[PDB]
């Protein structure tokens, strides 16, 4: 039989992939420079699609109660296409959300909480924006106090060798730096060179967290859309 | 005859000397720590007045601002004085000699800021970009030019009268810390950021102020007179 996972695997490369991630934070603490760095190409609601090969369809919906509305509009178009006489169906259900928190804050701000309370029923990855601004000791205090406030209020993406993947689940929320310019890519200060893909900055754990977990497809599919389905169909 | 300048130089140290500075920006992009770095001591409207020696003692008052409430307070000081100046006996005047407005490195000049500065600048404004280590040097100057072009588009900032090099570097982009590593500065694992090095532009601002506490007269003649010429009418 063992040739049948093969069949699935051979099927997927032939066919696939698709994905749609959503970017909220605050204009501007490095969101469009970082989402560009993520995938090694460059690019009120505005949406942008583009393909990568190595085959991946990305719809990076950058958000430039209106957003509770769009992502939930998409639960509604898919409940529509399912039901549903002739089915082919293109799901632009947002697989993941990337909430950028700014490094100036003892803090996680009230807006950030207010928002995540509203949008935590899609998968949220909290990401600390522009971490070149943070000292190591400073980075640590911020990371812990964010996580602390999260259990104090907020469903988040509960994230599914061992020593290595423990470290990944630990360092969340990832602090990161983005840039298209390179000198090694590239933040040039007359005292030092900020170097993405090191930790230095948390860019590799996030980028690799995103790639290994594109079973966010399922989390979003089963947990969050069904609940809109159970909900409006009542 | 020209000890007479020495007669004035002596009287001034023996009395000297006292100043008040006002802080507005945005909690928190480094305003409370920078100002500590600047005088070398750690410290709705709130004021902290502390006394510093160096033979001259400076009576430094520091009125930090947290968030129409602000112009009210800066102006009350004008009316406290107009009452007091015009009173029968003679006054301890807390007019705001000068304000540092703190602009954030997270802008390609924000609209709260232009709107705020518009209303107020009849108080001397020092525009200072906060936490300057955030900006790479090309972003540092590119941002400086956008503000500097945006500032004139509307805004009276405080006009600064080898004073040659300071004129260009304003608005200042400062980097404040009260930790200390291998001389004040910050510890990143790729490099080390020095307070006071230009590199930082904290030094240019530091001396901009000590060298100019003729901000004292600017307030007294131009800003207060007009409150007075105005409120009298
Ligand atoms: N040091 C540092 N500088 C950054 C970082 N991200 C962006 N910058 C710089 O500041 C700008 C950030 O703007 P942008 O990428 O448009 O962020 P956005 O407004 O959220 O889309 C960039 O053009 C860079 O010049 C970062 O992570 N670290
Ligand atoms: N990158 C950078 N970070 C700073 C600088 N100065 C302070 N910080 C950090 O930001 C915090 C500033 O605190 P504070 O000065 O009280 O901010 P504020 O009072 O809200 O304006 C400190 O805890 C430092 O960790 C700076 O010059 N550059």
From Swiss-Prot, chain B:
<dbReference type="GO" id="GO:0015629">
    <property type="term" value="C:actin cytoskeleton"/>
</dbReference>
<dbReference type="GO" id="GO:0002036">
    <property type="term" value="P:regulation of L-glutamate import across plasma membrane"/>
</dbReference>
<dbReference type="GO" id="GO:0032153">
    <property type="term" value="C:cell division site"/>
</dbReference>
<feature type="region of interest" description="Important for dimerization">
    <location>
        <begin position="190"/>
        <end position="199"/>
    </location>
</feature>
<dbReference type="GO" id="GO:0061640">
    <property type="term" value="P:cytoskeleton-dependent cytokinesis"/>
</dbReference>
<feature type="binding site">
    <location>
        <begin position="25"/>
        <end position="32"/>
    </location>
    <ligand>
        <name>GTP</name>
    </ligand>
</feature>
<dbReference type="GO" id="GO:0007224">
    <property type="term" value="P:smoothened signaling pathway"/>
</dbReference>
<keyword id="KW-0221">Differentiation</keyword>
<dbReference type="GO" id="GO:0032154">
    <property type="term" value="C:cleavage furrow"/>
</dbReference>
<keyword id="KW-0547">Nucleotide-binding</keyword>
<dbReference type="GO" id="GO:0003924">
    <property type="term" value="F:GTPase activity"/>
</dbReference>
<dbReference type="GO" id="GO:0005819">
    <property type="term" value="C:spindle"/>
</dbReference>
<feature type="site" description="Important for dimerization">
    <location>
        <position position="106"/>
    </location>
</feature>
<dbReference type="GO" id="GO:0005930">
    <property type="term" value="C:axoneme"/>
</dbReference>
<keyword id="KW-0137">Centromere</keyword>
<dbReference type="GO" id="GO:0060170">
    <property type="term" value="C:ciliary membrane"/>
</dbReference>
<dbReference type="GO" id="GO:0005654">
    <property type="term" value="C:nucleoplasm"/>
</dbReference>
<dbReference type="GO" id="GO:0005634">
    <property type="term" value="C:nucleus"/>
</dbReference>
<feature type="binding site">
    <location>
        <position position="44"/>
    </location>
    <ligand>
        <name>GTP</name>
    </ligand>
</feature>
<dbReference type="GO" id="GO:0032880">
    <property type="term" value="P:regulation of protein localization"/>
</dbReference>
<keyword id="KW-1003">Cell membrane</keyword>
<keyword id="KW-0472">Membrane</keyword>
<keyword id="KW-0966">Cell projection</keyword>
<keyword id="KW-0995">Kinetochore</keyword>
<keyword id="KW-0007">Acetylation</keyword>
<feature type="domain" description="Septin-type G">
    <location>
        <begin position="15"/>
        <end position="233"/>
    </location>
</feature>
<dbReference type="GO" id="GO:0007283">
    <property type="term" value="P:spermatogenesis"/>
</dbReference>
<keyword id="KW-0744">Spermatogenesis</keyword>
<keyword id="KW-0498">Mitosis</keyword>
<feature type="modified residue" description="Phosphotyrosine">
    <location>
        <position position="158"/>
    </location>
</feature>
<feature type="region of interest" description="G4 motif">
    <location>
        <begin position="130"/>
        <end position="133"/>
    </location>
</feature>
<dbReference type="GO" id="GO:0005525">
    <property type="term" value="F:GTP binding"/>
</dbReference>
<keyword id="KW-0131">Cell cycle</keyword>
<keyword id="KW-0158">Chromosome</keyword>
<dbReference type="GO" id="GO:0009986">
    <property type="term" value="C:cell surface"/>
</dbReference>
<feature type="binding site">
    <location>
        <position position="186"/>
    </location>
    <ligand>
        <name>GTP</name>
    </ligand>
</feature>
<feature type="binding site">
    <location>
        <position position="176"/>
    </location>
    <ligand>
        <name>GTP</name>
    </ligand>
</feature>
<feature type="binding site">
    <location>
        <begin position="131"/>
        <end position="139"/>
    </location>
    <ligand>
        <name>GTP</name>
    </ligand>
</feature>
<dbReference type="GO" id="GO:0005886">
    <property type="term" value="C:plasma membrane"/>
</dbReference>
<dbReference type="GO" id="GO:0032391">
    <property type="term" value="C:photoreceptor connecting cilium"/>
</dbReference>
<dbReference type="GO" id="GO:0015630">
    <property type="term" value="C:microtubule cytoskeleton"/>
</dbReference>
<keyword id="KW-0342">GTP-binding</keyword>
